[PDB]
Amino acid sequence: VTLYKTTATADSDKFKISQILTFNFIKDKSYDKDTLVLKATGNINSGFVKPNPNDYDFSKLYWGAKYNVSISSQSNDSVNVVDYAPKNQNEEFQVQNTLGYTFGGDISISNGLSGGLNGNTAFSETINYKQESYRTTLSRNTNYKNVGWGVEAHKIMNNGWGPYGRDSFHPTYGNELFLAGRQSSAYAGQNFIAQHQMPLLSRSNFNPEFLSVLSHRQDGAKKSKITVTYQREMDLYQICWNGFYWAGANYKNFKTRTFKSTYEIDWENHKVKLLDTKETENNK
Amino acid sequence: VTLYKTTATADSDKFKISQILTFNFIKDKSYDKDTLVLKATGNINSGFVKPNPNDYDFSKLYWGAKYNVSISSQSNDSVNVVDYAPKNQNEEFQVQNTLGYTFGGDISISNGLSGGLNGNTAFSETINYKQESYRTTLSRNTNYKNVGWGVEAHKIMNNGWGPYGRDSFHPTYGNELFLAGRQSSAYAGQNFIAQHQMPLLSRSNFNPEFLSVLSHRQDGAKKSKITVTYQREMDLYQICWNGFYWAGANYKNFKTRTFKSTYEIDWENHKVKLLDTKETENNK
Amino acid sequence: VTLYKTTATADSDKFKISQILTFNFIKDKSYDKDTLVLKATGNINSGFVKPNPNDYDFSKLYWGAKYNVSISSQSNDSVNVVDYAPKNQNEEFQVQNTLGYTFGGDISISNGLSGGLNGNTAFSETINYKQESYRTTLSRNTNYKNVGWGVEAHKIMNNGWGPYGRDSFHPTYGNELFLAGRQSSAYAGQNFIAQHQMPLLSRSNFNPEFLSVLSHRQDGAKKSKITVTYQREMDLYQICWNGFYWAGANYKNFKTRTFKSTYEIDWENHKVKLLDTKETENNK
Amino acid sequence: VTLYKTTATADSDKFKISQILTFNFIKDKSYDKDTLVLKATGNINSGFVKPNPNDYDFSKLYWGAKYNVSISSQSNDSVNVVDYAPKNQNEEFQVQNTLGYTFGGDISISNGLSGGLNGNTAFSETINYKQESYRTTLSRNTNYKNVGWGVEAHKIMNNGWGPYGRDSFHPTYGNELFLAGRQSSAYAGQNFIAQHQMPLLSRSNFNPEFLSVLSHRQDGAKKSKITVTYQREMDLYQICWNGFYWAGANYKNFKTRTFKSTYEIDWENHKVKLLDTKETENNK
Amino acid sequence: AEIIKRTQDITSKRLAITQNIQFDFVKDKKYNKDALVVKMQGFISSRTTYSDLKKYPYIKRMIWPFQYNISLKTKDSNVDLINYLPKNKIDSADVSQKLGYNIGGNFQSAPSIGGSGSFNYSKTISYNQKNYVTEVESQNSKGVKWGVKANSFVTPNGQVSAYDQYLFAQDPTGPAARDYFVPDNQLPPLIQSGFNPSFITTLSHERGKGDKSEFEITYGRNMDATYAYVTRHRLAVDRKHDAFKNRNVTVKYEVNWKTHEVKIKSITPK
Amino acid sequence: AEIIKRTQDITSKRLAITQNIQFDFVKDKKYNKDALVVKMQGFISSRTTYSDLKKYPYIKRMIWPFQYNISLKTKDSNVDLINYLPKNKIDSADVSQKLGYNIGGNFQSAPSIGGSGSFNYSKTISYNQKNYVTEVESQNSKGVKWGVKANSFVTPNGQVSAYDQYLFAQDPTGPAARDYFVPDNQLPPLIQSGFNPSFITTLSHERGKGDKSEFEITYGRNMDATYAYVTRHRLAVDRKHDAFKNRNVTVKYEVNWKTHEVKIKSITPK
Amino acid sequence: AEIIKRTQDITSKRLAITQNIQFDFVKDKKYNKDALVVKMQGFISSRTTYSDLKKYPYIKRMIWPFQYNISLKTKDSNVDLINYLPKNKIDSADVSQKLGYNIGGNFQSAPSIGGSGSFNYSKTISYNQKNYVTEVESQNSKGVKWGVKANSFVTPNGQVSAYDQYLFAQDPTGPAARDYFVPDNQLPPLIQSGFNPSFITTLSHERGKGDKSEFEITYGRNMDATYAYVTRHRLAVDRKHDAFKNRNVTVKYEVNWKTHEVKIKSITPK
């Protein structure tokens, strides 16, 4: 086994998205192909936009609700995606079933004798599990030449309230995700929860840390192309005063920012070079 | 110390019983005999048979209630069974004994004075232990040339009900092992608990993983015979409607399926070869 | 470092006391003296004597209440005891102090309005510690040429009752150590707790496991003498019926059995040989 | 890598302050400078002074309330302080937020019918953290040529009372730090808590254990000077009887004792030598 | 013990299933036969979809994977299955059982005297749950087959069984098909995205009787169907178990045991 | 430290006891004497049986092993027992003790003013239990004897002592002997199947005074008997402790300390 | 890092104190000076005694060790104390603090409607306790002195402070002195038997200024006295703290740093 390392980077200063790619080329004598371990890190800003505090009856904010990362080779080349991390979780939780029974009797003495009998049956169930603000699962488009991940807003706690998500729906108050007060006597743009109370990934920066393992045929091209995409989906969260109470609504992927970079991989010399970039701004 | 490995297999496609035998021959210079570590794995189907849903007042199902494995050498040969796993468990549990006492008095003031006192003595015991659906214990027929195990249905929970076993007996409702509802207004063949609620080993496949250590005299025969038997005992579980309530009954080993295989062991060349097989179907 | 091992044994078949001594002679180049690690094991029977079941109003039993072990060299020789195990334990326990406060109020509407206010202050302390039936502490006669231990009855639980000891004293019922029932309508010789309920060391065999480290001057005698003593103190536990209730009493070291053995230690050749023995039976 | 060790010490017998300095000079070929790991240990007495038991209406005691250690090089030399331990702690604690709800209804049957409905909403928060009598944080004067620490009285528990500190203030009883009884019918000099109830560092000796890592330029002086200062701040704790109740007050650093020592460091020969000392007694 | 590794990867566009297979030829000189460790990995999309019924657009259908199918099989008589993971196991549970009594007395200045007597029993059973349980459904010397089956799910107000017919259905939050069913953040990864299998088989091969064998590796799904619609200002929910069974892709690999060569022979469907 | 191993195995058909014995000759050149580690294993059947009394067929008898017997002994004066496992130990328990007070006040709109005072004590003792406890019953330089004794059992209504006379008896579920006693799944393995002993002894041997020694290894059982029968619409249960004692097999092994040879000399019973 | 070890052992018959001292000369060639690790061990008897007062035989006296004294000192200006264990430390405690509210409503068929409101606070502090606490009482470059002080004890009605004046006293179970005080099994080992010290000091020694130094190692006790007697059908208990202080033995060791020789010079008392 012989190991060759290099690194490549690519910035979208405009979107505040940045790609750090770390490459480990592995020559393994027991293996008939070239191996490439590729770690994808860096930065994807949430694209968070504060609400206008001057907004009175109606207000809106934008928040980073989902992050998408993908790593791909080309259909015409000999490069396959053979393994990656993290993989989809078959979730585990702990369960406690308790059954209980009490029986008893009482007696008391006066002029006249008195008495009684008490009996009851308790039962219950307790479940124990881990709760995360954002959840990572594989992209449905994953295949033999492509792996992708969706890091999506999952269980978000307002205060003691929640957990809320992108589609939370109360029949009256709608989506209360970032709604501060149902009956607040305040400006709409001041009736959102405090910025600091919002989950880190909604308001700050996502720092991805994904891994992929790619294989390359020795009789293939000396050089091939790998495409890495960093992307953020920004949701429009808005609240409004109907005269009696406050209600909320969340509009998904109302804004999108995507940073796609293609890298030239030199399998022979174990070098890597940024070739092309694509910065796509979508708005609804 | 020198180690020689091989494997042998044998299938009963009819019974859905399969034997995987793994052999480690150990030449140990500090030991005056030949050693054989023999791992027995593979498959023994439960022989589970679903009840007929059309059955009305009376119904029955068959379930894998016990699994028997045994490993033997021949009475005339120099081959002994010197060790094995698993062995019978001298069971351990934790006990917590608590004694408690509370004493107190109360007073209240108005026009007229009032008073009182309360006193209580609590005592209790808690036991903590492991509960398993099926239990593994040694066959009473175990001896210097034979080791056998019984993997038997042990503590089976209906829902919050149980634990039940092969011989559970309620004076009225009989054996409620797989009875869904005592007063269910349904078809008998639909008044069994859900298949998925049944323990894995009752309805699916047992995968044994037993171990044995055998010794062989160096002046003995170059070749000897080891007999490995995989077997399932199937119980007849039946329920019936007497007009007022449902009752149940479990009939043990009402069906039996046995797969016996004899292997030629070549102690000199460290080879193993399937010699004979025996497939026995018993029915009551 | 060079290491030389040997062993010596000595039996008192009469007292059911037996000494196993294991010797590790250590030649250590960094050290100007000879070293001897000496492990003392074996058997000291409790001397337990069952009560006579035919005894009616009054009865007695004997039990092993304390075990004494000691290891010594001679005053005139160059052999010192430099270390040993176990040593006296500066005991540790866990403490939890809790202070608590609740305050609340209630209101009720009827024809007439009513009310109320409840307030209370709780405080408590919990201590957590290890409890052992018998306790091991050093003999006060320990010195530079002698180490000894007393393995003494410490905290003995009747059932939920206790813990009791050799000197437990209730003003009425006396020492209830092994008393079965305070008001039992039974024979005195049948009003002791069940044998099996008695601590292992009171009724069975003590198996000592002590260690000592001895040093010897190189200019000293080639041969020296080490004296090892195994001893049991047997207590007389007795109960009696005064007409109304049962009472108990424990008389300490009412019987004593002692087994002293002297061993010739050959520091030059790293041999050990049993020289003398002494079997002393004391009775009150 | 080559390592050279030495030690130096300095005593202030008058103040019962003592400095143990341990030096590890590291020649590291991968590094262009000389390295010095310097462990500062020893003794700083609390300066504790018992109260006069004969004091009646008013009394006072002195206690070691804060300890200051510092390590410095000279402004004109090439010696920097590059690292040290301990560092300031970004403290962590565990939080449990629980929300709970119960709802139920009851019924009673006689000649005449009765009923009811009960409902409750519980919520709570629990925080879990470490509590220490004295706290260690860095001196604000710390810089590139100086590191210093303040080991200061932090959370002091009277009995179940507290935690108290140097500035604790009750509007009526003042600072109750070492006040035994609010309404005690005793001498002032006997109304302090028991000496043994006081924290170890207030009444006994502080044993510092600080570490510093210093760097030295190879082209610098063969010899340089390091200044090590051990210091105690003693607080005046006093109580008084106003006729109705007891009140307390704590006056900080009412006394100060400081021990400064300067050491000649020979970077070439890896020797260290005590050069100068300074013993400063401050009193208010 | 020298290892010779080969890898193969392939996707069925049709079914959205990807096989990532590692083949490790094990040259154990202490062993009597040829040996092969087959590591079966990849990605099986959930293919969870939400649609309006054609004939009845008012009726809303959620199709979702109840079970994931995995198997490895051979016809070569020279080949034996000698080990496989995971295997079926006996379930285990922690039990805590409590028996207690209370005996009280009391006095009042009425005056009255009161007595009390009480008995308590409680049992707690404690165990681990998985979203999906992995079961060996059949195995013999020529192959093994697993089913990864929907088991239990975390929801507000407790755990819910996969066999609960009202599962995933919700009071509609809109007119579209999706709105009649719980959001993504209330779905487990094995339904929201899919399954990443991890299975292993060790295979032996007799020497001097032929160099080539054929392996059939089958990945797939059994889809359930959940229906929801609104009638009379109320929600009617129904469930079809085994609505679409054996939605499987089968890939044939050819293994040359002498040249240590591994080729993809065929794939169905594409 | 060179080891020379020998093994012997033998079964008593009569008693259904199997001795599996490992003999490890230890050539420790730092040690003054010959050394032998004897590992005593095997299988002792419970021989739990259920039958009708001959003279009184209505009376039902369960015979079961209260205690398992294990010992190793020698007559060779040249031989010493220098170590053995397990040994007797001092029992240990975790204790938690709590003392508390409550002091309450209250006000009501009756109007009334109320006071309150309360005191609580509790102690918890916590410890481990085994089905069967292992005790050294005697030991000296020539041998050692253990008893593995029935202790305590998990029952659905708490723990039950082995000395409880009503143990294992049940309200009959049929006319047969077996039905008067609890089912297999309520019996511990040491009664349902039997005991797998695991004992060890280290033995020394003086040099130049003879090459051969004889070891007697005794495995066995002490059976209790539990009786049950139905009279006057009620179940009568009784118990005989030590009903059948020392149901033991003794195997004589001859050990040659020089040739490192180990022979089975005899067995009683067959 | 070569070590040269020496040992010395000696007992004071008078005081029943035994010093077991290990002297380890450390030849660290990376180190600027001579080095010596002194390991201070042994046994200090509790000397707990029970007696009748001479002048007043009805008054019962228990004398017991409140504190154990340990120190090591030198006069050699060439010698420095450069390390020692144990050292004084900052106490630590786990704290758990809880704040909560309850808001309840209720309805009765009287008919009546009820409301409820409640607030709860609780704080739990959790910490480790030792029978005896070890404190550095003084230390400098020429020596160090420890005191091992009675702290706290487990009692059946909670923990009790060593400074509690009623400590160890009990309702007499007889006429003898011993009977007025708690039994051995309620006494900690440090009172029932004594103390086994374990202390360490590292010492440096300047080179070329003399080969010999003198070390004074002092082991000892500070005895308290507890008095008990019966008057007016009641037990009167009193306590004298520091009844017998500095009951100490001092042993002088001479250390030759060049020859690595260690001699006992003297002992007071014998």
mmCIF file of C-alpha atoms in Angstrom, chain D residues 25-98:
data_model
loop_
_atom_site.group_PDB
_atom_site.id
_atom_site.type_symbol
_atom_site.label_atom_id
_atom_site.label_comp_id
_atom_site.label_asym_id
_atom_site.label_seq_id
_atom_site.Cartn_x
_atom_site.Cartn_y
_atom_site.Cartn_z
ATOM 1 C CA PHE D 25 15.287 22.425 29.771
ATOM 2 C CA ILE D 26 14.421 21.048 26.353
ATOM 3 C CA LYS D 27 16.848 21.131 23.385
ATOM 4 C CA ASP D 28 14.577 20.385 20.396
ATOM 5 C CA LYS D 29 16.390 20.159 17.032
ATOM 6 C CA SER D 30 13.164 20.933 15.123
ATOM 7 C CA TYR D 31 12.858 24.233 17.040
ATOM 8 C CA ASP D 32 15.038 27.328 16.605
ATOM 9 C CA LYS D 33 14.847 28.311 20.285
ATOM 10 C CA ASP D 34 15.537 26.990 23.773
ATOM 11 C CA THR D 35 12.539 25.665 25.705
ATOM 12 C CA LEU D 36 11.947 25.639 29.464
ATOM 13 C CA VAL D 37 9.134 23.782 31.175
ATOM 14 C CA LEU D 38 8.844 25.195 34.654
ATOM 15 C CA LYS D 39 6.672 23.661 37.362
ATOM 16 C CA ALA D 40 5.931 25.868 40.343
ATOM 17 C CA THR D 41 4.958 24.054 43.573
ATOM 18 C CA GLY D 42 5.447 24.357 47.352
ATOM 19 C CA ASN D 43 3.527 26.046 50.166
ATOM 20 C CA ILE D 44 1.586 29.205 50.902
ATOM 21 C CA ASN D 45 0.141 29.272 54.423
ATOM 22 C CA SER D 46 -3.362 30.747 54.765
ATOM 23 C CA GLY D 47 -2.213 33.046 57.578
ATOM 24 C CA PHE D 48 -5.310 31.916 59.499
ATOM 25 C CA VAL D 49 -5.767 33.510 62.924
ATOM 26 C CA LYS D 50 -8.289 32.068 65.396
ATOM 27 C CA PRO D 51 -10.778 34.400 67.048
ATOM 28 C CA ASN D 52 -10.394 35.287 70.737
ATOM 29 C CA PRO D 53 -12.984 33.144 72.605
ATOM 30 C CA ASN D 54 -13.186 35.775 75.385
ATOM 31 C CA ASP D 55 -14.611 38.371 72.960
ATOM 32 C CA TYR D 56 -18.201 39.121 74.028
ATOM 33 C CA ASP D 57 -20.350 41.492 71.920
ATOM 34 C CA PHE D 58 -17.908 41.850 69.025
ATOM 35 C CA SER D 59 -15.266 39.547 67.499
ATOM 36 C CA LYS D 60 -12.954 38.988 64.528
ATOM 37 C CA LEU D 61 -10.916 36.353 62.687
ATOM 38 C CA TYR D 62 -8.444 36.372 59.788
ATOM 39 C CA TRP D 63 -8.599 33.841 56.945
ATOM 40 C CA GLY D 64 -6.727 33.070 53.721
ATOM 41 C CA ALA D 65 -9.218 34.286 51.099
ATOM 42 C CA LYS D 66 -7.068 34.425 47.988
ATOM 43 C CA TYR D 67 -3.729 33.164 46.722
ATOM 44 C CA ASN D 68 -1.754 34.774 43.936
ATOM 45 C CA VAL D 69 1.046 33.156 42.004
ATOM 46 C CA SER D 70 2.996 34.696 39.127
ATOM 47 C CA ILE D 71 5.936 33.778 36.901
ATOM 48 C CA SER D 72 7.829 36.459 34.894
ATOM 49 C CA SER D 73 10.818 37.198 32.717
ATOM 50 C CA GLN D 74 12.422 40.623 32.235
ATOM 51 C CA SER D 75 11.377 43.216 29.644
ATOM 52 C CA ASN D 76 14.920 43.567 28.297
ATOM 53 C CA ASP D 77 15.567 39.838 27.736
ATOM 54 C CA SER D 78 14.705 37.366 24.953
ATOM 55 C CA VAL D 79 12.618 35.145 27.191
ATOM 56 C CA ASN D 80 8.892 34.754 26.507
ATOM 57 C CA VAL D 81 6.079 32.855 28.262
ATOM 58 C CA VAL D 82 4.564 30.770 25.415
ATOM 59 C CA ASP D 83 2.236 28.433 27.330
ATOM 60 C CA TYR D 84 0.956 27.528 30.790
ATOM 61 C CA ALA D 85 -1.541 25.551 32.878
ATOM 62 C CA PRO D 86 -4.192 25.799 34.130
ATOM 63 C CA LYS D 87 -6.076 27.988 31.681
ATOM 64 C CA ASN D 88 -9.403 29.769 32.169
ATOM 65 C CA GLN D 89 -12.367 27.447 31.968
ATOM 66 C CA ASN D 90 -15.286 27.995 29.665
ATOM 67 C CA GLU D 91 -17.521 26.211 32.157
ATOM 68 C CA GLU D 92 -20.034 23.531 31.175
ATOM 69 C CA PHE D 93 -23.211 22.336 32.837
ATOM 70 C CA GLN D 94 -25.981 19.858 32.156
ATOM 71 C CA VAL D 95 -29.602 20.886 31.762
ATOM 72 C CA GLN D 96 -32.859 18.986 32.010
ATOM 73 C CA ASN D 97 -36.102 20.650 30.912
ATOM 74 C CA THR D 98 -39.237 18.667 31.765
#
